[PDB]
Amino acid sequence: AVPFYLPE
Amino acid sequence: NYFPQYPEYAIETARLRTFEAWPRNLKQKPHQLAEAGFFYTGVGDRVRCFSCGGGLMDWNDNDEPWEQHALWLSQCRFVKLMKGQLYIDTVAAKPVLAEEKE
Ligand SMILES: [Zn+2]
């Protein structure tokens, strides 16, 4: 899996 | 202080419910993902973690929800809570996973 959103 | 990004999906059953429309096509079954802290976005195979808010997509048949969680979102409180810090560190040490990360 690959992220489409990561926390700032 | 810490507080979940999506307080509404803090409950396992609430998370499981979102997977109603989840594609039967995917190997990662609703139970695994929901228990990993994920809830379905309703689009493709996109999921988000209630605590850290991080979102994962493009799941491979060989993917384990918990491993992907700890590998990409290592700072996530829910992972630390349920799995522990050592698990997070070990996940990142596994060659196949280490490479996904780059
Ligand atoms: Zn998380």
mmCIF file of all heavy atoms in Angstrom, chain B residues 57-97:
data_model
loop_
_atom_site.group_PDB
_atom_site.id
_atom_site.type_symbol
_atom_site.label_atom_id
_atom_site.label_comp_id
_atom_site.label_asym_id
_atom_site.label_seq_id
_atom_site.Cartn_x
_atom_site.Cartn_y
_atom_site.Cartn_z
ATOM 1 N N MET B 57 -3.857 3.453 0.371
ATOM 2 C CA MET B 57 -4.524 2.941 -0.819
ATOM 3 C C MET B 57 -3.589 1.971 -1.562
ATOM 4 O O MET B 57 -2.435 1.776 -1.154
ATOM 5 C CB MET B 57 -4.931 4.105 -1.739
ATOM 6 C CG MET B 57 -3.744 4.918 -2.263
ATOM 7 S SD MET B 57 -4.290 6.370 -3.218
ATOM 8 C CE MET B 57 -4.858 5.579 -4.720
ATOM 9 N N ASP B 58 -4.086 1.413 -2.667
ATOM 10 C CA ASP B 58 -3.366 0.450 -3.517
ATOM 11 C C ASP B 58 -2.794 -0.745 -2.757
ATOM 12 O O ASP B 58 -1.573 -0.954 -2.682
ATOM 13 C CB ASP B 58 -2.293 1.141 -4.379
ATOM 14 C CG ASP B 58 -2.873 2.235 -5.287
ATOM 15 O OD1 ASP B 58 -3.922 2.007 -5.932
ATOM 16 O OD2 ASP B 58 -2.281 3.331 -5.351
ATOM 17 N N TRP B 59 -3.703 -1.470 -2.116
ATOM 18 C CA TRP B 59 -3.364 -2.644 -1.339
ATOM 19 C C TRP B 59 -2.977 -3.837 -2.216
ATOM 20 O O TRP B 59 -3.674 -4.185 -3.169
ATOM 21 C CB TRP B 59 -4.542 -3.023 -0.420
ATOM 22 C CG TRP B 59 -4.861 -1.966 0.618
ATOM 23 C CD1 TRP B 59 -5.610 -0.849 0.438
ATOM 24 C CD2 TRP B 59 -4.403 -1.933 1.979
ATOM 25 N NE1 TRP B 59 -5.655 -0.108 1.584
ATOM 26 C CE2 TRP B 59 -4.926 -0.744 2.545
ATOM 27 C CE3 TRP B 59 -3.616 -2.766 2.769
ATOM 28 C CZ2 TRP B 59 -4.673 -0.382 3.869
ATOM 29 C CZ3 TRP B 59 -3.365 -2.404 4.089
ATOM 30 C CH2 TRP B 59 -3.892 -1.225 4.622
ATOM 31 N N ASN B 60 -1.846 -4.451 -1.882
ATOM 32 C CA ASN B 60 -1.362 -5.633 -2.588
ATOM 33 C C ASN B 60 -1.927 -6.833 -1.829
ATOM 34 O O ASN B 60 -2.200 -6.730 -0.633
ATOM 35 C CB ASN B 60 0.165 -5.675 -2.570
ATOM 36 C CG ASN B 60 0.803 -4.488 -3.266
ATOM 37 O OD1 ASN B 60 0.418 -4.137 -4.380
ATOM 38 N ND2 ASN B 60 1.803 -3.892 -2.631
ATOM 39 N N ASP B 61 -2.085 -7.965 -2.512
ATOM 40 C CA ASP B 61 -2.632 -9.197 -1.931
ATOM 41 C C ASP B 61 -1.902 -9.629 -0.644
ATOM 42 O O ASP B 61 -2.516 -10.181 0.270
ATOM 43 C CB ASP B 61 -2.561 -10.341 -2.963
ATOM 44 C CG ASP B 61 -3.088 -9.941 -4.340
ATOM 45 O OD1 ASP B 61 -2.364 -9.214 -5.057
ATOM 46 O OD2 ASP B 61 -4.221 -10.355 -4.700
ATOM 47 N N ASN B 62 -0.592 -9.384 -0.620
ATOM 48 C CA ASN B 62 0.317 -9.720 0.482
ATOM 49 C C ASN B 62 0.373 -8.727 1.639
ATOM 50 O O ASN B 62 1.095 -8.946 2.616
ATOM 51 C CB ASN B 62 1.727 -9.890 -0.088
ATOM 52 C CG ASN B 62 2.241 -8.627 -0.794
ATOM 53 O OD1 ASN B 62 1.783 -8.285 -1.892
ATOM 54 N ND2 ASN B 62 3.198 -7.934 -0.173
ATOM 55 N N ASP B 63 -0.411 -7.658 1.561
ATOM 56 C CA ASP B 63 -0.414 -6.645 2.612
ATOM 57 C C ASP B 63 -1.201 -6.992 3.877
ATOM 58 O O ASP B 63 -2.333 -7.492 3.822
ATOM 59 C CB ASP B 63 -0.922 -5.302 2.071
ATOM 60 C CG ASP B 63 0.084 -4.573 1.205
ATOM 61 O OD1 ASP B 63 1.240 -5.029 1.084
ATOM 62 O OD2 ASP B 63 -0.296 -3.528 0.644
ATOM 63 N N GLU B 64 -0.589 -6.707 5.023
ATOM 64 C CA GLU B 64 -1.195 -6.916 6.318
ATOM 65 C C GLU B 64 -1.477 -5.503 6.826
ATOM 66 O O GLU B 64 -0.560 -4.695 6.946
ATOM 67 C CB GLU B 64 -0.203 -7.619 7.250
ATOM 68 C CG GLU B 64 0.099 -9.068 6.896
ATOM 69 C CD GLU B 64 1.113 -9.701 7.832
ATOM 70 O OE1 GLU B 64 1.125 -9.353 9.033
ATOM 71 O OE2 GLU B 64 1.892 -10.561 7.365
ATOM 72 N N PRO B 65 -2.754 -5.177 7.086
ATOM 73 C CA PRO B 65 -3.224 -3.876 7.571
ATOM 74 C C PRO B 65 -2.379 -3.263 8.685
ATOM 75 O O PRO B 65 -2.092 -2.061 8.641
ATOM 76 C CB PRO B 65 -4.648 -4.195 8.034
ATOM 77 C CG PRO B 65 -5.099 -5.155 6.993
ATOM 78 C CD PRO B 65 -3.890 -6.100 6.925
ATOM 79 N N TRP B 66 -1.980 -4.073 9.658
ATOM 80 C CA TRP B 66 -1.190 -3.615 10.787
ATOM 81 C C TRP B 66 0.221 -3.214 10.413
ATOM 82 O O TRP B 66 0.753 -2.239 10.950
ATOM 83 C CB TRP B 66 -1.173 -4.669 11.879
ATOM 84 C CG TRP B 66 -2.291 -4.582 12.893
ATOM 85 C CD1 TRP B 66 -3.110 -5.588 13.272
ATOM 86 C CD2 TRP B 66 -2.644 -3.438 13.693
ATOM 87 N NE1 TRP B 66 -3.955 -5.171 14.265
ATOM 88 C CE2 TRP B 66 -3.693 -3.865 14.547
ATOM 89 C CE3 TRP B 66 -2.198 -2.125 13.787
ATOM 90 C CZ2 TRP B 66 -4.284 -3.015 15.480
ATOM 91 C CZ3 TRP B 66 -2.789 -1.271 14.723
ATOM 92 C CH2 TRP B 66 -3.821 -1.730 15.554
ATOM 93 N N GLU B 67 0.827 -4.000 9.527
ATOM 94 C CA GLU B 67 2.184 -3.755 9.064
ATOM 95 C C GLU B 67 2.263 -2.453 8.269
ATOM 96 O O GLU B 67 3.185 -1.649 8.461
ATOM 97 C CB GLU B 67 2.679 -4.921 8.194
ATOM 98 C CG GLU B 67 3.010 -6.179 8.993
ATOM 99 C CD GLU B 67 3.722 -7.247 8.193
ATOM 100 O OE1 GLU B 67 3.697 -7.200 6.947
ATOM 101 O OE2 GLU B 67 4.321 -8.134 8.831
ATOM 102 N N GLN B 68 1.298 -2.265 7.370
ATOM 103 C CA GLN B 68 1.219 -1.082 6.521
ATOM 104 C C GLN B 68 0.974 0.165 7.362
ATOM 105 O O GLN B 68 1.455 1.263 7.050
ATOM 106 C CB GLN B 68 0.123 -1.276 5.457
ATOM 107 C CG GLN B 68 0.396 -2.417 4.462
ATOM 108 C CD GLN B 68 1.629 -2.170 3.603
ATOM 109 O OE1 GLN B 68 1.572 -1.429 2.623
ATOM 110 N NE2 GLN B 68 2.739 -2.801 3.955
ATOM 111 N N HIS B 69 0.229 -0.031 8.444
ATOM 112 C CA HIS B 69 -0.125 1.015 9.393
ATOM 113 C C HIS B 69 1.131 1.511 10.114
ATOM 114 O O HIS B 69 1.401 2.708 10.164
ATOM 115 C CB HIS B 69 -1.121 0.451 10.420
ATOM 116 C CG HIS B 69 -2.048 1.467 11.006
ATOM 117 N ND1 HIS B 69 -2.829 1.220 12.119
ATOM 118 C CD2 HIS B 69 -2.361 2.716 10.612
ATOM 119 C CE1 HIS B 69 -3.584 2.281 12.365
ATOM 120 N NE2 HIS B 69 -3.323 3.193 11.459
ATOM 121 N N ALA B 70 1.853 0.570 10.713
ATOM 122 C CA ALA B 70 3.081 0.857 11.459
ATOM 123 C C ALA B 70 4.233 1.349 10.574
ATOM 124 O O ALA B 70 5.041 2.161 11.012
ATOM 125 C CB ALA B 70 3.524 -0.393 12.257
ATOM 126 N N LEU B 71 4.302 0.851 9.340
ATOM 127 C CA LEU B 71 5.367 1.222 8.400
ATOM 128 C C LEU B 71 5.232 2.664 7.920
ATOM 129 O O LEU B 71 6.197 3.416 7.928
ATOM 130 C CB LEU B 71 5.359 0.271 7.186
ATOM 131 C CG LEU B 71 6.466 0.121 6.116
ATOM 132 C CD1 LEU B 71 6.241 1.026 4.920
ATOM 133 C CD2 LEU B 71 7.878 0.283 6.686
ATOM 134 N N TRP B 72 4.043 3.024 7.455
ATOM 135 C CA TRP B 72 3.809 4.365 6.938
ATOM 136 C C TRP B 72 3.456 5.417 7.978
ATOM 137 O O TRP B 72 3.865 6.563 7.855
ATOM 138 C CB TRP B 72 2.719 4.328 5.871
ATOM 139 C CG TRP B 72 3.081 3.570 4.609
ATOM 140 C CD1 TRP B 72 2.518 2.424 4.170
ATOM 141 C CD2 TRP B 72 4.061 3.955 3.632
ATOM 142 N NE1 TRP B 72 3.065 2.048 2.974
ATOM 143 C CE2 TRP B 72 4.016 2.959 2.617
ATOM 144 C CE3 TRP B 72 4.962 5.005 3.494
ATOM 145 C CZ2 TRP B 72 4.835 3.013 1.485
ATOM 146 C CZ3 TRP B 72 5.781 5.059 2.368
ATOM 147 C CH2 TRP B 72 5.712 4.061 1.385
ATOM 148 N N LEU B 73 2.624 5.038 8.942
ATOM 149 C CA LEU B 73 2.169 5.941 10.004
ATOM 150 C C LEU B 73 2.705 5.497 11.379
ATOM 151 O O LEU B 73 1.925 5.209 12.305
ATOM 152 C CB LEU B 73 0.633 5.939 10.027
ATOM 153 C CG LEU B 73 -0.074 6.191 8.684
ATOM 154 C CD1 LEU B 73 -1.555 5.769 8.735
ATOM 155 C CD2 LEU B 73 0.029 7.674 8.332
ATOM 156 N N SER B 74 4.027 5.417 11.493
ATOM 157 C CA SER B 74 4.727 4.986 12.704
ATOM 158 C C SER B 74 4.477 5.856 13.950
ATOM 159 O O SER B 74 4.667 5.404 15.078
ATOM 160 C CB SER B 74 6.236 4.883 12.428
ATOM 161 O OG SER B 74 6.760 6.096 11.925
ATOM 162 N N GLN B 75 4.037 7.093 13.748
ATOM 163 C CA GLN B 75 3.784 8.016 14.846
ATOM 164 C C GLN B 75 2.366 7.892 15.398
ATOM 165 O O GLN B 75 2.029 8.519 16.415
ATOM 166 C CB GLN B 75 4.062 9.461 14.398
ATOM 167 C CG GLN B 75 5.488 9.751 13.903
ATOM 168 C CD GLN B 75 6.576 9.225 14.829
ATOM 169 O OE1 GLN B 75 7.520 8.569 14.384
ATOM 170 N NE2 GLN B 75 6.492 9.581 16.105
ATOM 171 N N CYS B 76 1.554 7.058 14.751
ATOM 172 C CA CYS B 76 0.164 6.833 15.126
ATOM 173 C C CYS B 76 0.001 6.234 16.519
ATOM 174 O O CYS B 76 0.576 5.185 16.837
ATOM 175 C CB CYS B 76 -0.539 5.948 14.089
ATOM 176 S SG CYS B 76 -2.276 5.615 14.445
ATOM 177 N N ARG B 77 -0.814 6.915 17.322
ATOM 178 C CA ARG B 77 -1.089 6.540 18.699
ATOM 179 C C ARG B 77 -1.776 5.183 18.831
ATOM 180 O O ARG B 77 -1.445 4.401 19.718
ATOM 181 C CB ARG B 77 -1.909 7.643 19.371
ATOM 182 C CG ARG B 77 -1.084 8.872 19.784
ATOM 183 C CD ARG B 77 0.012 8.522 20.803
ATOM 184 N NE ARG B 77 0.563 9.726 21.433
ATOM 185 C CZ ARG B 77 0.164 10.227 22.605
ATOM 186 N NH1 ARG B 77 -0.792 9.628 23.305
ATOM 187 N NH2 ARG B 77 0.716 11.336 23.080
ATOM 188 N N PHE B 78 -2.720 4.899 17.935
ATOM 189 C CA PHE B 78 -3.464 3.637 17.977
ATOM 190 C C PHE B 78 -2.564 2.433 17.726
ATOM 191 O O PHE B 78 -2.844 1.340 18.228
ATOM 192 C CB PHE B 78 -4.634 3.659 16.972
ATOM 193 C CG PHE B 78 -5.603 2.510 17.115
ATOM 194 C CD1 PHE B 78 -6.361 2.354 18.275
ATOM 195 C CD2 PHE B 78 -5.762 1.578 16.095
ATOM 196 C CE1 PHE B 78 -7.249 1.298 18.406
ATOM 197 C CE2 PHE B 78 -6.659 0.514 16.243
ATOM 198 C CZ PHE B 78 -7.393 0.387 17.388
ATOM 199 N N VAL B 79 -1.561 2.606 16.863
ATOM 200 C CA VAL B 79 -0.616 1.540 16.566
ATOM 201 C C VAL B 79 0.239 1.304 17.811
ATOM 202 O O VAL B 79 0.420 0.156 18.221
ATOM 203 C CB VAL B 79 0.321 1.887 15.364
ATOM 204 C CG1 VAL B 79 1.180 0.682 14.988
ATOM 205 C CG2 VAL B 79 -0.479 2.300 14.161
ATOM 206 N N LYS B 80 0.780 2.389 18.373
ATOM 207 C CA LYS B 80 1.616 2.322 19.575
ATOM 208 C C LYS B 80 0.860 1.643 20.711
ATOM 209 O O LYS B 80 1.414 0.798 21.427
ATOM 210 C CB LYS B 80 2.038 3.728 20.037
ATOM 211 C CG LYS B 80 2.948 4.504 19.091
ATOM 212 C CD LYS B 80 3.455 5.770 19.752
ATOM 213 C CE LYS B 80 4.177 6.680 18.779
ATOM 214 N NZ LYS B 80 5.434 6.088 18.248
ATOM 215 N N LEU B 81 -0.415 2.003 20.841
ATOM 216 C CA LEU B 81 -1.297 1.476 21.873
ATOM 217 C C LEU B 81 -1.565 -0.025 21.749
ATOM 218 O O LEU B 81 -1.371 -0.772 22.703
ATOM 219 C CB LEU B 81 -2.633 2.237 21.866
ATOM 220 C CG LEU B 81 -3.756 1.823 22.834
ATOM 221 C CD1 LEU B 81 -3.365 2.090 24.282
ATOM 222 C CD2 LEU B 81 -5.043 2.578 22.497
ATOM 223 N N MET B 82 -2.042 -0.450 20.584
ATOM 224 C CA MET B 82 -2.365 -1.858 20.379
ATOM 225 C C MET B 82 -1.188 -2.777 20.068
ATOM 226 O O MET B 82 -1.136 -3.893 20.566
ATOM 227 C CB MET B 82 -3.413 -2.012 19.271
ATOM 228 C CG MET B 82 -4.710 -1.226 19.476
ATOM 229 S SD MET B 82 -5.477 -1.345 21.132
ATOM 230 C CE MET B 82 -6.337 -2.835 20.986
ATOM 231 N N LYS B 83 -0.252 -2.297 19.258
ATOM 232 C CA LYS B 83 0.890 -3.101 18.847
ATOM 233 C C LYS B 83 2.186 -2.925 19.618
ATOM 234 O O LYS B 83 3.016 -3.819 19.629
ATOM 235 C CB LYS B 83 1.161 -2.899 17.342
ATOM 236 C CG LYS B 83 -0.009 -3.275 16.414
ATOM 237 C CD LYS B 83 -0.512 -4.716 16.640
ATOM 238 C CE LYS B 83 0.412 -5.786 16.035
ATOM 239 N NZ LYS B 83 -0.064 -7.188 16.319
ATOM 240 N N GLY B 84 2.418 -1.725 20.129
ATOM 241 C CA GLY B 84 3.649 -1.479 20.848
ATOM 242 C C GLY B 84 4.718 -0.860 19.961
ATOM 243 O O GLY B 84 4.630 -0.927 18.721
ATOM 244 N N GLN B 85 5.717 -0.228 20.583
ATOM 245 C CA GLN B 85 6.803 0.427 19.866
ATOM 246 C C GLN B 85 7.738 -0.552 19.156
ATOM 247 O O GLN B 85 8.217 -0.264 18.061
ATOM 248 C CB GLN B 85 7.602 1.332 20.816
ATOM 249 C CG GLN B 85 8.565 2.318 20.124
ATOM 250 C CD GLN B 85 7.868 3.182 19.073
ATOM 251 O OE1 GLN B 85 6.895 3.880 19.366
ATOM 252 N NE2 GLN B 85 8.348 3.113 17.839
ATOM 253 N N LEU B 86 8.007 -1.692 19.791
ATOM 254 C CA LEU B 86 8.908 -2.711 19.232
ATOM 255 C C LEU B 86 8.396 -3.255 17.900
ATOM 256 O O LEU B 86 9.173 -3.477 16.964
ATOM 257 C CB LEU B 86 9.121 -3.851 20.234
ATOM 258 C CG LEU B 86 9.896 -3.472 21.501
ATOM 259 C CD1 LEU B 86 9.913 -4.663 22.435
ATOM 260 C CD2 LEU B 86 11.321 -3.014 21.164
ATOM 261 N N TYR B 87 7.078 -3.424 17.810
ATOM 262 C CA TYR B 87 6.436 -3.922 16.594
ATOM 263 C C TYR B 87 6.705 -2.936 15.463
ATOM 264 O O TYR B 87 7.040 -3.331 14.347
ATOM 265 C CB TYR B 87 4.914 -4.102 16.784
ATOM 266 C CG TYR B 87 4.153 -4.528 15.538
ATOM 267 C CD1 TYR B 87 4.199 -5.835 15.083
ATOM 268 C CD2 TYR B 87 3.417 -3.620 14.793
ATOM 269 C CE1 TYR B 87 3.508 -6.239 13.921
ATOM 270 C CE2 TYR B 87 2.715 -4.013 13.645
ATOM 271 C CZ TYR B 87 2.778 -5.316 13.210
ATOM 272 O OH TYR B 87 2.071 -5.686 12.082
ATOM 273 N N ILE B 88 6.485 -1.658 15.763
ATOM 274 C CA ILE B 88 6.690 -0.560 14.819
ATOM 275 C C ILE B 88 8.129 -0.573 14.290
ATOM 276 O O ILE B 88 8.350 -0.487 13.086
ATOM 277 C CB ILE B 88 6.362 0.813 15.501
ATOM 278 C CG1 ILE B 88 4.876 0.875 15.863
ATOM 279 C CG2 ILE B 88 6.745 2.001 14.601
ATOM 280 C CD1 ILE B 88 4.466 2.093 16.677
ATOM 281 N N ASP B 89 9.079 -0.774 15.204
ATOM 282 C CA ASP B 89 10.505 -0.824 14.869
ATOM 283 C C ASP B 89 10.860 -2.071 14.036
ATOM 284 O O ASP B 89 11.709 -2.020 13.140
ATOM 285 C CB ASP B 89 11.347 -0.816 16.160
ATOM 286 C CG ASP B 89 11.266 0.495 16.933
ATOM 287 O OD1 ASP B 89 10.932 1.539 16.331
ATOM 288 O OD2 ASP B 89 11.563 0.479 18.148
ATOM 289 N N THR B 90 10.241 -3.201 14.374
ATOM 290 C CA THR B 90 10.473 -4.474 13.689
ATOM 291 C C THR B 90 9.891 -4.455 12.267
ATOM 292 O O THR B 90 10.496 -4.984 11.330
ATOM 293 C CB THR B 90 9.896 -5.669 14.535
ATOM 294 O OG1 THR B 90 10.553 -5.715 15.808
ATOM 295 C CG2 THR B 90 10.100 -7.015 13.846
ATOM 296 N N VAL B 91 8.730 -3.822 12.115
ATOM 297 C CA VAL B 91 8.052 -3.704 10.824
ATOM 298 C C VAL B 91 8.964 -3.004 9.822
ATOM 299 O O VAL B 91 9.146 -3.470 8.693
ATOM 300 C CB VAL B 91 6.697 -2.931 10.987
ATOM 301 C CG1 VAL B 91 6.138 -2.433 9.653
ATOM 302 C CG2 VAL B 91 5.669 -3.857 11.598
ATOM 303 N N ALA B 92 9.561 -1.914 10.279
ATOM 304 C CA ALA B 92 10.450 -1.096 9.480
ATOM 305 C C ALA B 92 11.785 -1.806 9.168
ATOM 306 O O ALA B 92 12.460 -1.480 8.194
ATOM 307 C CB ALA B 92 10.641 0.242 10.190
ATOM 308 N N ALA B 93 12.091 -2.853 9.934
ATOM 309 C CA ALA B 93 13.312 -3.639 9.753
ATOM 310 C C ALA B 93 13.156 -4.766 8.720
ATOM 311 O O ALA B 93 14.153 -5.249 8.173
ATOM 312 C CB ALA B 93 13.763 -4.206 11.104
ATOM 313 N N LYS B 94 11.929 -5.247 8.512
ATOM 314 C CA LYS B 94 11.645 -6.312 7.543
ATOM 315 C C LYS B 94 11.981 -5.784 6.143
ATOM 316 O O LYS B 94 11.374 -4.825 5.687
ATOM 317 C CB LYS B 94 10.161 -6.708 7.617
ATOM 318 C CG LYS B 94 9.751 -7.482 8.880
ATOM 319 C CD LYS B 94 8.251 -7.766 8.989
ATOM 320 C CE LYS B 94 7.709 -8.561 7.803
ATOM 321 N NZ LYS B 94 8.500 -9.777 7.464
ATOM 322 N N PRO B 95 12.902 -6.452 5.421
ATOM 323 C CA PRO B 95 13.352 -6.085 4.073
ATOM 324 C C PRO B 95 12.271 -5.660 3.068
ATOM 325 O O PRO B 95 12.346 -4.548 2.526
ATOM 326 C CB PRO B 95 14.153 -7.328 3.619
ATOM 327 C CG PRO B 95 13.688 -8.419 4.516
ATOM 328 C CD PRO B 95 13.546 -7.703 5.833
ATOM 329 N N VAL B 96 11.281 -6.527 2.819
ATOM 330 C CA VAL B 96 10.177 -6.251 1.882
ATOM 331 C C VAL B 96 9.454 -4.930 2.200
ATOM 332 O O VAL B 96 9.130 -4.151 1.296
ATOM 333 C CB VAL B 96 9.172 -7.478 1.791
ATOM 334 C CG1 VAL B 96 8.576 -7.831 3.163
ATOM 335 C CG2 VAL B 96 8.052 -7.228 0.786
ATOM 336 N N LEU B 97 9.222 -4.699 3.491
ATOM 337 C CA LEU B 97 8.552 -3.489 3.969
ATOM 338 C C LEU B 97 9.462 -2.259 3.906
ATOM 339 O O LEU B 97 9.033 -1.167 3.509
ATOM 340 C CB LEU B 97 8.025 -3.728 5.396
ATOM 341 C CG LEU B 97 6.999 -4.862 5.534
ATOM 342 C CD1 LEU B 97 6.562 -4.954 6.968
ATOM 343 C CD2 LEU B 97 5.790 -4.630 4.634
#
